[PDB]
Amino acid sequence: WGNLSYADLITKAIESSAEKRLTLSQIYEWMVKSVPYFKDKGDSNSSAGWKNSIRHNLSLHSKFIRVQNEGTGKSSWWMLNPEGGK
Template identity: 50%
Template sequence: PPYSYATLIRYAIENSPNQKLTLSQIYDWVIEHYPYYATAGPGWKNSIRHNLSLNKCFVRTPRPVTEPGKGSYWKVD
């Protein structure tokens, strides 16, 4: 894909119904829209995590108590 990981993450979050996604949901969106990543090996997932952690435009928000599950949500700031 001709996009940076940060761009892929932004597209995934901005195209979600609530403008927020968990890490797992971001992975799923990327694979659904760019099937290349389904067979690309695990390295791209490290790059996604790296971009979420270091890029200041992505903000981690806690999962509400009313929504049980694993992981926080990520939003675009």
């Protein structure tokens, strides 16, 4: 779907937001709305190979930090490590 890996799609998705933080569902909706290949996936449940790959990259790569959302039953924030670490 281009020259970008999943980790970079997610990275710029987070950076696109003004608060530099996104829930997992917000990341999904970005891909569907910002990337040409994911336009078709308007209504996909979890897994979904690409959604599975996204969750995989979030947990695998340490550039992504899962932060407690407070609150109202909403899923956690996915943010980027400032110094990068990795």
